[PDB]
Amino acid sequence: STVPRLHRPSLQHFREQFLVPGRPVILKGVADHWPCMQKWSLEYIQEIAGCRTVPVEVGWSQTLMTVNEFISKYIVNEPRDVGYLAQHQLFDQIPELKQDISIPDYCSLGDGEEEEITINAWFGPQGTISPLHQDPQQNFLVQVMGRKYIRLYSPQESGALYPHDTHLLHNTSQVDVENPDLEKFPKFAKAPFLSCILSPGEILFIPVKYWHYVRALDLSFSVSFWWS
Ligand SMILES: O=C(O)C[C@@H]1CC(=O)N(O)C1=O
Ligand SMILES: [Mn+2]
């Protein structure tokens, strides 16, 4: 039930053993020496991005503030609520930061165009939680700062995850993974899963439609690549 870790697997090995069957894996030795891994201090983030406006999810509402405000209020000064700079195309907004990352070569195995890969930043304090849900594209999730606990359930287990009925929320589970209501959601308890702690320099492959749940264990910065 652990996600396997592979060092720089060949494109063919990744394609045949993980991409085509839709199996998660952690890629080591791929992003570990990207510039972001050494450069992205809080101070560097403030210097490069501090004055720019970013969307922040407050745990639930959505607001806007500068990066400096986000750091001051939700990171450094004993925050009062949880705030998460989540799912934001920060690298389109701030092209200088795009210099510190790369598109993984494995994305070339997809059917889509490189121009259509979506690169999102996920920057927040210890304790951010993304509830269990599934996405409609493949994902490489690159961990830069801090660690994340991640739980993964196959699409084959969707019945045991009790998706919301609304079309809007049908890709999201009704269950709180880490404190499930087994009186209401009894099938959840026996559903098999994989899990990991994703650390800096590692890349998690989340296959298209794989259900995933994520909790930050430390001050955390991740970069995701959504591709097909
Ligand atoms: O890290 C998180 O809190 C949530 C993750 C990051 C990511 O790329 N996707 O699709 C998520 O759901
Ligand atoms: Mn997701």
Side-chain angles (χ1 to χ4, degrees), residues 84 86-87 120-123 128-135 137-143 148-150 198 204 206 212-216 220-226:
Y84 198 4
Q87 197 183 332
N120 278 306
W122 305 81
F123 174 46
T128 62
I129 294 172
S130 290
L132 187 62
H133 68 285
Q134 60 178 177
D135 294 310
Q137 291 194 96
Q138 319 285 356
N139 184 357
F140 287 127
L141 179 60
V142 181
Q143 195 61 22
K148 276 171 162 171
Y149 175 59
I150 303 182
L198 192 66
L204 176 65
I206 306 175
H212 49 286
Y213 168 91
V214 181
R215 175 163 58 91
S220 172
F221 202 129
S222 321
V223 179
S224 61
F225 300 79
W226 288 352

Side-chain angles (χ1 to χ4, degrees), residues 68-167:
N68 283 327
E69 289 179 288
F70 175 68
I71 292 170
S72 184
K73 288 197 54 144
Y74 296 102
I75 304 300
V76 305
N77 293 129
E78 218 190 336
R80 284 59 168 162
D81 314 68
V82 183
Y84 198 4
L85 201 183
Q87 197 183 332
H88 177 60
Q89 291 172 244
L90 188 70
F91 311 99
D92 285 345
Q93 181 183 21
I94 310 179
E96 186 175 358
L97 288 175
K98 212 182 165 172
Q99 304 292 300
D100 297 334
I101 61 170
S102 305
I103 293 181
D105 294 334
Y106 302 93
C107 298
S108 73
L109 298 168
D111 301 309
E113 298 283 351
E114 169 165 321
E115 284 86 348
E116 298 306 290
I117 293 179
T118 301
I119 312 177
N120 278 306
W122 305 81
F123 174 46
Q126 174 179 322
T128 62
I129 294 172
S130 290
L132 187 62
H133 68 285
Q134 60 178 177
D135 294 310
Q137 291 194 96
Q138 319 285 356
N139 184 357
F140 287 127
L141 179 60
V142 181
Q143 195 61 22
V144 182
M145 174 189 318
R147 302 165 302 144
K148 276 171 162 171
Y149 175 59
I150 303 182
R151 292 265 286 272
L152 301 168
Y153 290 82
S154 169
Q156 303 180 352
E157 297 306 325
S158 306
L161 310 179
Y162 302 88
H164 283 272
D165 289 297
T166 87
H167 167 79

